[PDB]
Amino acid sequence: LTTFSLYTIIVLLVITSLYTLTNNNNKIIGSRWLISQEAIYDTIMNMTKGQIGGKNWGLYFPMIFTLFMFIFIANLISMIPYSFALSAHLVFIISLSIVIWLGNTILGLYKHGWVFFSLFVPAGTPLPLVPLLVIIETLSYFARAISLGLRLGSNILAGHLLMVILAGLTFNFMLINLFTLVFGFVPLAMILAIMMLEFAIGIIQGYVWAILTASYLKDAVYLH
Amino acid sequence: MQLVLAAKYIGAGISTIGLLGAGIGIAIVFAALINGVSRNPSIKDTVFPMAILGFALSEATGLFCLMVSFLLLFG
Amino acid sequence: MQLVLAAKYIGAGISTIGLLGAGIGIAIVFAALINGVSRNPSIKDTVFPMAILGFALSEATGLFCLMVSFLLLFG
Amino acid sequence: QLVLAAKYIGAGISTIGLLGAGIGIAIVFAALINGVSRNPSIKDTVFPMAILGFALSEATGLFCLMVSFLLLFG
Amino acid sequence: MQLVLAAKYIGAGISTIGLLGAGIGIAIVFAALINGVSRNPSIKDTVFPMAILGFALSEATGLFCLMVSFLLLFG
Amino acid sequence: MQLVLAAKYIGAGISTIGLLGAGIGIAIVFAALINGVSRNPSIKDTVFPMAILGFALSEATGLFCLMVSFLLLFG
Amino acid sequence: QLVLAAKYIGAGISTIGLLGAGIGIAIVFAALINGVSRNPSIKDTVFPMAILGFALSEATGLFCLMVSFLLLFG
Amino acid sequence: MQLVLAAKYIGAGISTIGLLGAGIGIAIVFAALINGVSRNPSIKDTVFPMAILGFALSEATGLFCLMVSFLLL
Amino acid sequence: MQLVLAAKYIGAGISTIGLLGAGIGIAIVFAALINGVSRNPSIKDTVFPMAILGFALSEATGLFCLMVSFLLLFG
Amino acid sequence: QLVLAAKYIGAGISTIGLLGAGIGIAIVFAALINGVSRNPSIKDTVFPMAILGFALSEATGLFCLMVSFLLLFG
Amino acid sequence: MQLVLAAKYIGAGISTIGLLGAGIGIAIVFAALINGVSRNPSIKDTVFPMAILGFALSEATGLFCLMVSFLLLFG
Amino acid sequence: ISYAAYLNVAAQAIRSTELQTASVLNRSQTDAFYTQYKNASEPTPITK
Amino acid sequence: MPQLVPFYFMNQLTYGFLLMITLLILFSQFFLPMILRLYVSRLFISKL
Amino acid sequence: MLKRFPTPILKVYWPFFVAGAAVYYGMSKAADLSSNT
Amino acid sequence: KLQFALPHETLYSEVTQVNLPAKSGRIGVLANHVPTVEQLLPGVVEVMEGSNSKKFFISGGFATVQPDSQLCVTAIEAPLESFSENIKNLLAEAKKNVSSSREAAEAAIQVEVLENLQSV
Q1: Taking the domains of chain E in order of start, what are their residue ranges?
Q2: Looking at beta carbons, which residues of chain J come within 8 Å of H30?
Q3: In 3D, which of F2, F3, F1, F7 has the Cα closest to residue F73?
Q4: The CATH fold of domain H2-73
Q5: Interface contact flag, B14 C19, Cβ < 8 Å
Q6: Are A194 and F63 within 8 A, CB to CB?
Q7: Phi, psi values for residue E7, rounded to 5°
Q8: Domain count, chain L
Q9: Contact A88/A78 with Cβ under 8 angstroms?
């Protein structure tokens, strides 16, 4: 079939096993794998109660949880060496960002009427530069549109490409003269350090996604 | 002409340098926020609106730079 | 002439670099605002007009870079 | 040919822009450490503020990077 | 000849970089003002003439630069 | 031919310039770490993993610059 | 020909030197504002010193400006 | 030939610039060490390891710039 | 000839860049003078000649930079 | 002769790098004087530390210089 | 050769840039001196020897830049 | 001279418009003689 | 490159938007309220 | 184990879904134009 | 909370914003604030509990946010209205006194008080 289609299936199957094969039939005491997804549940519950913090925060608490977990699993799958990304197929992540951004813009229009453009008066400021601050607030409003997706996309794509380029160099490092085969473990360790870093910047990015589109959702639900 | 088309691709690169300034700038405003809020924990509610105004303006200088880049790119 | 048309577009890109300085400037003013408000809790009524004035003047210098850029780019 | 050369050269130029972002991220984190060390107890309010500030700092750098990519690929 | 006209427009761009310094400079003077008022509001009236003086002098270096920009650009 | 290969080498060199800011960045986070820890004697256990996070993030910006340098250098 | 172009470019590059002096001037004045706010009363001694510090910082910039005119006019 | 060989020499030169940030970086770390030690006194035994760690990481960024110069050479 | 003479002028322009650091430098000495004098109220009789020494030394680097510029410029 | 031109140019570009070390070195000694003036007594512990840092900051500048000579000579 | 002699003059200009760093550097040491001495008063006896050491190496970095500049310039 | 001596002088200055009360005035006027003693020995009871 | 620019975008996006809606419903109705149940159960015994 | 606890999502997430259909359609056309090359 | 306490008074020994003139310039303390000890310079003080504000002229002292949100302010003697024309006349004489005669520092402090009084 299609590698992308097959890996969308792998993400679904990983997520299904994480709330089935992790505890047996609900044991109150808790089972060691499920302790992780308790802490994740709580720190995003108390975070988006911290952000949007309405009474509809919990209505967007599943949404912010599946925006976490999607990015969280798809930046472990792409970290497998022989594996074909979903998230580093940028077109889905950037498109998803634009969907959420438009669904914020429409939500803002719905919630804050035609006085939605009062959002683009940032604060009470001198009147001869009130219109300026509408232009360069709206410019920033759809700079917010692409930043959120492209941040995550660039980090993951660049990380894998960096590792692969260094791997290709280290292939030829270990296929040339024996003085280069001395300290042959040191480039392997260097690539390993980057691989450790690439997990870090992906997991932080899932949190950055979910705080940033909580900040945007704060803007969209409540005026400012 | 190869020279004119080339000039767009070089010139775009040159433009991109300017954006860096706003980037440092954004961080500076946020740094002050963190320190400020630490120094008086209850200042947070007053200051946070001020912070968002400042963020937008500091960022805006970067945006203007990026617009000129796009004019060379797609001009 | 191909050189001259390319030179116009290039000169614009170079000018775009100038914006960065104003960008750092904006941040410095707002950082000061945040620090000051933390000191007094209450200076802001006086200081906020001064801050807007300071912002405008810093911004104006940035705009001087921008107008030279547009003279080169368009003109 | 001249146009192709210009893409590769042009791309290089754009990369200088990233340096500012690199400094920026650090400034937010330094402030995080300063704030945390100053209050102790501010950490829970300040930590989400700091991550947001980090993200925004990163965003300007990201735009520089995207112009670089755009020239490289076309 | 074309090279001369090219050099004028390129050179115009190059000079524009000098303006960035003044953009930071204006902000520094206003930052000092903001901090001064917040640290002692009784200083404010004394500091304000000195602030305007320092602002003008800082800005001036940039305005000299901007005139050089027009000397290159127009010729 | 020669020009394209040359162009690749030049662009790579320019890209190396990008890295410097991240280098300084790593130091800045560590400086804050030392200064904070000397203030509290005790913040350190909480702050140390936070400091590592800030380090990684700063470093990553530099990694992006480097990988772009590699794309131009190696192809 | 090439020489004419060269003096215009060289003049451009020399103008950049001014940047440092402009920053310099503000740093002296910033310290003036900071000092006077600290003492309320340092100012009588300091105000002459501040004009001195300003002049000297500015003087470096004036060297930049005259080189620019020496290329451009000369 | 000439253009490519020239480009190698030039490209190497540009690569040296990246190192300057690390140089300054190292200084900042040691400055912090001195400041910390002067502030606390007694913090030093914990703080000195932290300073060494920060030093090493700063140096690594510069090292990357340096090796790229060597490759171009 | 045209290229060599041109190169004198270009090289001179480039040389003038170095001066910017000295401009900031003098200010750093004098800022410390003002700040210092506000710190002691009374150190000043020692500190004023000490400061002039500091000024001169920072300035000297500037003069060296200017010298190379003059050697290129005048020939 | 393009290659020979480039050889001399390459040396020049490498010379730029040294400016950073000049600032850096000063920062280490600035810290020394600040620390020592606040404590007095810290100086005996701090001076070995200062010398270590001094050497390290310098070494980066030495590398930049080393490439200048390496390019110049070939 | 026109190209080589040109490259020497241009190259000389580039070398002069290195000096800026020493200019700022020297000023930083002297700034710390004036601040430190005004804070303590009497630290000066120890500190003046320390200050000469710091001055010397900062200056020396400048001298390294300078000698390369002369080497290119003269031949 | 001490920091609190500075504050003391300030407190005395503060008992200077005219809307004052006796207890205030008494708080800033007191009579005492510090007799600096010595090792038996004793420099005079010099007014405080 | 395939990991850079493909042109398979609508094919990709069809399977992509399907995976998102699947996970959204799946989390929201099934797996999240089963965590909220663990919390409430622990608290109900805690209350009793 | 698994149990459906209904969550109102129609009344919550309608603007998101409207945006999804529009972007889906616009990207369908974009994909067809990009698969030409 | 707040304690504004003195030997012979216990003014404000709840309170929401207090505005103080301190060695750190002028300081405002509002709700939770970082736990500090700062010597208050000779001062014009405003204490606000809600919007209501009470104004004190204060001989300096020490200020200490305690980590239990007890703002201990201790000073020797305060109301602003009680302190504050005849005093300006007396202080003028005291300014003369610095010329003639520790007493130099004392009279200098009196001049400082005259500046503070002028602020009132």
Answers
A1: 2-75
A2: 28, 31, 49-50, 52-54, 56-57
A3: F7
A4: F1FO ATP Synthase (1.20.20)
A5: no
A6: yes
A7: -65, -35
A8: 1
A9: yes
DSSP state of O41: P
Question: Which of B47, B58, B69 to probe by mutation at the C interface, max C CB count within 10 Å?
Answer: B58
Structural domain span for residue O46:
1-84
Which chains border F (3 or more CB–CB pairs < 8 Å)? A, D, H
- What Rg do the C-alpha atoms of chain O give, in angstroms? 16
Cβ neighbours of residue I65 closer than 8 Å, sequence gap 6 or more: I15, I18, I19, I22, K16, K19, K20, K23
Number of H helices, E strands in chain G: 3, 0
- Proportion of chain I in helix, strand, coil states, percent, rounded to 5: 90, 0, 10
Selection from F58, E16, A135 nearest residue B15 by Cα: E16
Asked if D18 and F64 touch (Cβ cutoff 8 Å), the reply is: yes
Resolution (A): 4.5
Name the region of A24 (left: φ>0; alpha: ψ -120 to 50; beta: rest): beta
Round the CA-based radius of gyration of chain E to a whole number and report it: 18
Method: cryo-EM
- Closest CA of chain M from A82, distance in Å: 12
Residues of A in contact with N7 (CB under 8 A): 59, 62
Architecture of domain E2-75: Up-down Bundle (1.20)
In CATH, J1-74 is 1.20.20.10: yes
Which chain G positions have a beta carbon within 8 Å of E43's beta carbon?
A: 36-37, 40
The whole-angstrom separation of Cα A155 and Cα D54 is: 14
Whether the CB of I34 is below 8 Å from some CB of chain G: the reply is: yes
Judged by CB atoms closer than 8 Å, whether chains meet at C39 and O17 is answered as no
Q: Do C35 and E39 touch (CB under 8 A)?
A: no
Return the closest-CA partner of residue F43 out of F53, F54, F32, F57.
F32
Helix, strand or coil for residue H31? helix
- Alpha-carbon span A167 to O22, nearest angstrom: 62
Identify which of F7, F50, F68 has the shortest CB distance to residue D9: F7
In this structure, the answer to whether residues O51 and O104 fall within a common structural domain is: no
| CA dihedral angle for residue D53, residue D59, residue D65, residue D70, rounded to 10 degrees | 180
> In chain O, which among 1-60 make CB contacts under 8 A with chain E?
24-26
CA A99, A104, A106, A107 dihedral sign is: positive
Question: Element (H or E) spanning O17, and its range?
Answer: strand O17-22
- Cα atoms found within 13 Å of the Cα of residue F61, Cβ hemisphere only: 38
Contact at CB, M8 and N35, closer than 8 angstroms? yes
Cα(I69)–Cα(E11) distance, rounded to whole angstroms? 19
Q: What's the token pair of residue J24?
A: 């850096």
Task: Label the pairing between strands L33-35 and L45-47.
Answer: antiparallel
**Distance, CA of A184 to chain centre:** 35
3-state SS class at B42: helix
If asked whether residues O29 and O13 sit together in one domain, one would say: yes
Chain-centroid distance of CA C69 in Å reads 14
As a whole number of Å, the end-to-end CA separation of chain H is 15
Integer Cα distance of L44 and L48 in angstroms: 11
Of D48, D58, D69, the CB nearest to A211: D48
Q: What is the DSSP string of chain K?
A: -HHHHHHHHHHHHHHHTTHHHHHHHHHHHHHHHHHHHHHSSTTHHHHHHHHHHHHHHHHHHHHHHHHHHHHHHH-
Which helix or strand (DSSP H or E) is residue O3 part of?
strand O3-5
Q: Which residues contact J70 (CB under 8 A, 6 or more apart)?
A: H73
Conformation bin of residue E53: beta by default, left when phi > 0, alpha when psi is -120 to 50: alpha
